[PDB]
Amino acid sequence: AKAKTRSSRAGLQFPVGRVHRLLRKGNYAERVGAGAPVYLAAVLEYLTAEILELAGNAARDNKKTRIIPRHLQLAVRNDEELNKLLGRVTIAQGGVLPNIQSVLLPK
Amino acid sequence: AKAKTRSSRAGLQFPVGRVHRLLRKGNYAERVGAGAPVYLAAVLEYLTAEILELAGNAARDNKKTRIIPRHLQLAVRNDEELNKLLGRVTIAQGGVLPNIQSVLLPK
Amino acid sequence: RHRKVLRDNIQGITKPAIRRLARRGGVKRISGLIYEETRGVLKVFLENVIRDAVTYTEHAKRKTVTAMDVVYALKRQGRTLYGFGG
Amino acid sequence: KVLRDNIQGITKPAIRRLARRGGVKRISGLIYEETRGVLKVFLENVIRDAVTYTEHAKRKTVTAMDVVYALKRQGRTLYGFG
Amino acid sequence: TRKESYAIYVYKVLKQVHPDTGISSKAMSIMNSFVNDVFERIAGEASRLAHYNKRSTITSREIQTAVRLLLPGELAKHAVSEGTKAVTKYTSAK
Amino acid sequence: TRKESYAIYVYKVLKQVHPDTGISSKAMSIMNSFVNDVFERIAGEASRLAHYNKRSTITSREIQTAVRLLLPGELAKHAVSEGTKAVTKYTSAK
Amino acid sequence: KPHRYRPGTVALREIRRYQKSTELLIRKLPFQRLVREIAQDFKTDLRFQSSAVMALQEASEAYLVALFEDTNLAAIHAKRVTIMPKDIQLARRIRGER
Amino acid sequence: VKKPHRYRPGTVALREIRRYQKSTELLIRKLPFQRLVREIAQDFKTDLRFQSSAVMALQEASEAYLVALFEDTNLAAIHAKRVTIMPKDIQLARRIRGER
DNA sequence: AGCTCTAGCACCGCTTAAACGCACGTACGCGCTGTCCCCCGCGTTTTAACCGCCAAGGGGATTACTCCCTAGTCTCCAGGCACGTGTCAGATATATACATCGAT
DNA sequence: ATCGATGTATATATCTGACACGTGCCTGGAGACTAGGGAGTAATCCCCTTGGCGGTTAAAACGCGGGGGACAGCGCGTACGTGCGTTTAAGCGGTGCTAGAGCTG
Numbered sequence: 014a015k016a017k018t019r020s021s022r023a024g025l026q027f028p029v030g031r032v033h034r035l036l037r038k039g040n041y042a043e044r045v046g047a048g049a050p051v052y053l054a055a056v057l058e059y060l061t062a063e064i065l066e067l068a069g070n071a072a073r074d075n076k077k078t079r080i081i082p083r084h085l086q087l088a089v090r091n092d093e094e095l096n097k098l099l100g101r102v103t104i105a106q107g108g109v110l111p112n113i114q115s116v117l118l119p120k
Numbered sequence: 121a122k123a124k125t126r127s128s129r130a131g132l133q134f135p136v137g138r139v140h141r142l143l144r145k146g147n148y149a150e151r152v153g154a155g156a157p158v159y160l161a162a163v164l165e166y167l168t169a170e171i172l173e174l175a176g177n178a179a180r181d182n183k184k185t186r187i188i189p190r191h192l193q194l195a196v197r198n199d200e201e202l203n204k205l206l207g208r209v210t211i212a213q214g215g216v217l218p219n220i221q222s223v224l225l226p227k
Numbered sequence: 228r229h230r231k232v233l234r235d236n237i238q239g240i241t242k243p244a245i246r247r248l249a250r251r252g253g254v255k256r257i258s259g260l261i262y263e264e265t266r267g268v269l270k271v272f273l274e275n276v277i278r279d280a281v282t283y284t285e286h287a288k289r290k291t292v293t294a295m296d297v298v299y300a301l302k303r304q305g306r307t308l309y310g311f312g313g
Numbered sequence: 314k315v316l317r318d319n320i321q322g323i324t325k326p327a328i329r330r331l332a333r334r335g336g337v338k339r340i341s342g343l344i345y346e347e348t349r350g351v352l353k354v355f356l357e358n359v360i361r362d363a364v365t366y367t368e369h370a371k372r373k374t375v376t377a378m379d380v381v382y383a384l385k386r387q388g389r390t391l392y393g394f395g
Numbered sequence: 396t397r398k399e400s401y402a403i404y405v406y407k408v409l410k411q412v413h414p415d416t417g418i419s420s421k422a423m424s425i426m427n428s429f430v431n432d433v434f435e436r437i438a439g440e441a442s443r444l445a446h447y448n449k450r451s452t453i454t455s456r457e458i459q460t461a462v463r464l465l466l467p468g469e470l471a472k473h474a475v476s477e478g479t480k481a482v483t484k485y486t487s488a489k
Numbered sequence: 490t491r492k493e494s495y496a497i498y499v500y501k502v503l504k505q506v507h508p509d510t511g512i513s514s515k516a517m518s519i520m521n522s523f524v525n526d527v528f529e530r531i532a533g534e535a536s537r538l539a540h541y542n543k544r545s546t547i548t549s550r551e552i553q554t555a556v557r558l559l560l561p562g563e564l565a566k567h568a569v570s571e572g573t574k575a576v577t578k579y580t581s582a583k
Numbered sequence: 584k585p586h587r588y589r590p591g592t593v594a595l596r597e598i599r600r601y602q603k604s605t606e607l608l609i610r611k612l613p614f615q616r617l618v619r620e621i622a623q624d625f626k627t628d629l630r631f632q633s634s635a636v637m638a639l640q641e642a643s644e645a646y647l648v649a650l651f652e653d654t655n656l657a658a659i660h661a662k663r664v665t666i667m668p669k670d671i672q673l674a675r676r677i678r679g680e681r
Numbered sequence: 682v683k684k685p686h687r688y689r690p691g692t693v694a695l696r697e698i699r700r701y702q703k704s705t706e707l708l709i710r711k712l713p714f715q716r717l718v719r720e721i722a723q724d725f726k727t728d729l730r731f732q733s734s735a736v737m738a739l740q741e742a743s744e745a746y747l748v749a750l751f752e753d754t755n756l757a758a759i760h761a762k763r764v765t766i767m768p769k770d771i772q773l774a775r776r777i778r779g780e781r
Numbered sequence: 782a783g784c785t786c787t788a789g790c791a792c793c794g795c796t797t798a799a800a801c802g803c804a805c806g807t808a809c810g811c812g813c814t815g816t817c818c819c820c821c822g823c824g825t826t827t828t829a830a831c832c833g834c835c836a837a838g839g840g841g842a843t844t845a846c847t848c849c850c851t852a853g854t855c856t857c858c859a860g861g862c863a864c865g866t867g868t869c870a871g872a873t874a875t876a877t878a879c880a881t882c883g884a885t
Numbered sequence: 886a887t888c889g890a891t892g893t894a895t896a897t898a899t900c901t902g903a904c905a906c907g908t909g910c911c912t913g914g915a916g917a918c919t920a921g922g923g924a925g926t927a928a929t930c931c932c933c934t935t936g937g938c939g940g941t942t943a944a945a946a947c948g949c950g951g952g953g954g955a956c957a958g959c960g961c962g963t964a965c966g967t968g969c970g971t972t973t974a975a976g977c978g979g980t981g982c983t984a985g986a987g988c989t990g
Contacts, residue, residue, distance in 0.1 A: 015916095016857085016859075017916095018859090018914070019485075019914080019915075022489070023481050026411065028914085029914090030914045031399075033914090035438075039540075041147065041441055041445070043451045044452040044453070044850090044923080045452065046452050046457075047454075047851075048482040048486075049455055052459065053478075055477055055481035056462050056477070058408060059477045060466075062408055065412055066412055066413075068422075069409075069416050072416060077871085078415065078416060078871095079416070080417070080418050080419065080422060082425060083705045094468040094469060098466060101388055103389055104392055105391065105392060105393025105421065105738070106705050106741070108334075108703075108704070109336070111699060111703055113695070113699070116759055116764065118695075119689075119695070129579055130576075130582070131578045132575055133501055142532075146529075148533065148539075149539045149540075149544075153546055153549060155549030155580075156535075156547045156551065158549075159552045159553065160528070160552050162574075162575035163527075163531065163568045166564070166567060166568050167560075167564075168499050168520065168524065172502060172507065172520075173507070175516075176503075176510050179510065185511060187503075188605070189310065189516045200562075201563060204561045205564070207779055210645040211309050211519055212310030216602055216652070220595065220598060221656075223659045224253075224254075224255045224595065228630055229619060229629070232623070233623060236613065236620040239617050240609060242946090244608060249651045251651070252650070252655060253598060253652055253655055254658070254666055255591065255598075256594070256664055256666075256821080257666065257820080257821090258666060258667050259819080260667065261666055261671070264672075268675065268680075270621070272643065273617065273639070273643065277618065278625060280635075281622060281626060282460055282464060283447070286460040290840065292622070292630065294632055295447070297638040301642050303440075308642050309522040309526070311518070313518075313521060313523075316723075318720070319717050322717060323713060324713065327710060327800095328747075330708045331748060332747075333694070333697060334701050334702060334744075334748050334751075335748045335754070337751060337754070338765065339691070339764060339766075339808095339965070341765055341767055341964090344766060344767075344771070347771045351775065359739065360718065360725070363722075363735075364722055364729065368554075369538055372986075373985075374984095374985075376732050376735055380742075381428075384742050386537075389742070389745075390432055391741070391742055392428040392432070393424055394424065394734055395427070398863095403861075417904070417905080420903075451923060452923075587823070590820080590822060590951090591821085611830080630935075632934080656773065657773065660757065660760075660761060660770075664953095673756065673757070676756070677756065678777055686883075687967060688882080690967065691808080691966075693966090710799090710975060712975055730984085731789085764809075765809075765810080
């Protein structure tokens with residue numbers, strides 16, 4: 014019959030088959046369930062969608078249509094929750110926030 | 121022929137076979153070499169012997185013939201290298217090292 | 228199994244208990260504002276540990292929060308705990 | 314060719330600029346010395362792991378893969394070099 | 396030789412969330428590392444949850460617990476829903 | 490049923506290093522947990538070292554590199570020394 | 584004429600007394616009630632093993648004594664001896680918990 | 682004797698405190714950092730080579746460490762009612778993390 | 782073990798802005814001195830933790846059964862990756878408008 | 886309070902090399918297939934957690950006094966910062982070299 018990719022059956026933009034092969038070849042367990050690569054591809058797609066959503070918002074705030082890892086750093090760090098996930102993460106060519114302490118301002 | 125354990129073949133007292141079985145069942149790799157269980161058992165013996173020696177010295181300093189977990193905390197926290205190893209590790213029934221800051225001491 | 232809907236148990240960690248917990252750490256004097264910030268950070272830490280512990284229970288389809296689940300939950304946050312099997 | 318010392322190569326206005334990227338107003342005179350010290354011990358810790366990673370693979374150069382992997386083991390993942 | 400990555404997939408995801416945004420090659424590398432690291436975290440705790448319960452399979456329950464574990468907060472309330480709908484699609488497609 | 494533990498082995502280690510000193514049960518479990526934790530750490534680092542070099546077999550060199558990474562300072566040198574003499578004794582006695 | 588010691592002496596005496604002891608500084612039953620209160624809104628009708636409760640005891644006590652040692656260092660750095668909530672926040676936020 | 686127009690000590694510091702936090706360029710010069718990386722990897726062995734991406738990653742990670750440590754150092758300094766940093770602030774920021 | 786060939790390394794020139802040292806000034810560190818209120822140590826008082834005993838029975842654990850599910854093998858083809866081409870958006874440059882900071 | 890230079894930002898055009906797009910090509914995802922044992926379920930026993938009781942008593946809570954210790958204020962002064970001028974080595978480019986990655990067998 015005509016072959017259909019499992020990501021399209023799942024309605025996903027991330028590969029079910031590649032994730033399933035990596036779960037097999039990562040040797041995490043002896044067996045891998047059917048819906049587990051679908052579910053993991055879906056959570057990867059959701060995280061990618063949120064992080065690129067914040068990246069696009071930061072880029073539009075910067076008025077720069079192609080996103081830079083600076084825009085990525087503003088995307089990850091300004092989010093109150095996503096910063097906790099990427100807390101022990103250094104983004105290459107990322108930089109820091111333009112924060113000035115209230116005492117350090119001139120009188 | 122007569123069965124003879126691999127631990128005595130290696131001059132070793134933690135078991136070769138148990139470490140080999142937990143290496144195979146631990147899903148670390150598809151294959152495990154012959155020298156891997158004996159080497160890992162030797163490393164485990166060195167660490168256990170060092171901590172037991174320091175705990176016995178600390179118990180002689182406290183004058184009991186028993187290693188209480190307080191002696192284990194005193195053993196693993198007084199040695200700088202073992203402190204660097206077990207830095208993020210909490211040992212139960214251990215307390216803290218009896219240290220006082222010199223600013224807090226009056227005279 | 229809860230006998231009653233418990234509330235306001237944060238005062239169970241008393242000011243003298245906070246005073247001993249500070250004394251083991253090696254501090255001489257305690258201000259009055261310590262005794263609620265300490266309770267707040269204690270509440271935050273226990274919420275963070277018990278959330279992971281109860282997820283470990285519900286993955287096992289259990290009703291009892293065993294010691295092994297607490298050990299693995301504390302291992303997940305980077306604070307490994309010994310003396311409870313491991 | 315063996316280099317003698319380039320601890321002083323880490324420039325004092327460069328430490329000033331890194332601290333200003335950190336968000337400080339003023340810098341003490343000793344900061345240029347203990348900042349070089351902590352940078353040296355951190356690079357010691359990272360480079361030791363990097364070189365032993367390279368020695369594991371029968372390789373005699375140090376790749377960005379092994380630097381990123383040593384940083385990942387150290388507790389600070391690095392994104393941007395694989 | 397050929398090297399395997401996630402560049403076209405994150406490009407498709409960015410295109411469907413934003414039709415008029417570009418993205419640099421350094422960001423290709425960062426998304427590749429980020430997807431690989433999140434996959435490594437989730438699969439690692441899936442293996443740990445399998446080994447804690449004497450479990451020989453990794454089903455959707457282990458991954459669901461891992462997603463509830465790594466991610467706290469509202470994404471913990473989001474990513475366990477979205478992926479659920481994914482397998483809700485999959486059981487309606489197989 | 491029976492649960493596996495490293496109790497008697499670290500007990501005879503204690504008898505070898507301090508022949509006139511006993512052990513308590515709580516400290517016994519603490520040492521068992523320490524043995525399991527260090528075993529998991531070194532085996533995980535060896536698994537990473539094998540996977541990152543496209544290697545499928547964990548050899549003695551794998552764990553030698555793993556203990557060179559994990560144990561800091563002079564304990565690394567004594568660990569690799571005792572491991573090397575153990576494996577040479579194993580090969581010579583075989 | 585009572586034997587009132589100088590305030591700032593018996594505090595150090597009991598610092599030395601507590602630092603050599605492994606007894607549990609938090610009572611078992613208030614921590615039972617607190618643990619049940621925290622675990623109540625995560626699932627109703629949960630049960631706890633006694634060894635799990637002891638694990639909460641030891642982990643909580645170790646975390647609190649480490650935090651208080653760090654805030655003591657932060658306080659003595661700030662040319663003061665009494666810890667304040669700003670010391671708590673500073674030690675936590677340098678540690679990265681915020 | 683007339684004097685040229687000049688700023689207060691601290692306000693051009695704030696002008697570049699805003700200027701240097703909006704950019705993402707590397708702060709350490711590339712050659713001295715590469716030479717330092719080469720000299721640290723000498724007691725391990727000689728004749729070791731580094732790819733340019735390896736030195737790039739090392740410099741980026743070390744600059745990230747220094748910027749995070751300097752935020753913590755400035756925060757320790759502002760805790761002590763001071764606007765400038767001190768060395769003991771550096772050992773405080775190292776000691777709270779448990780890496781001293 | 783061995784061929785191929787990327788790229789790390791060595792170097793050399795010049796243009797270059799930072800790097801460097803120094804000169805002048807002032808905000809800021811540090812210490813003193815002030816008020817004072819904040820907490821510690823106390824006995825008295827009072828609550829509940831604690832032991833332990835008993836008991837109800839839920840719930841984890843074991844044993845047993847049977848079946849859906851996934852590794853495994855085989856065949857096949859299209860999505861995916863390397864490769865190539867060419868716009869096009871960002872960097873660069875110059876002119877213009879607005880605003881923070883200085884000091885009239 | 887007001888006005889001025891210095892500084893950052895705003896606007897428009899030219900220019901360029903990375904990224905968007907397309908094409909050829911092939912490893913690996915997909916479909917079909919059987920088999921085996923892990924997995925889900927039920928039946929079962931029973932450790933063990935919850936619950937209640939009672940008395941013991943250690944300890945929490947309470948108020949008291951008083952004096953360090955916090956902290957505002959002040960002054961002084963060294964050490965910063967800012968600036969100009971000079972010096973210098975990074976930065977950039979090309980050239981030349983081969984060690985040593987990297988793939989196949």
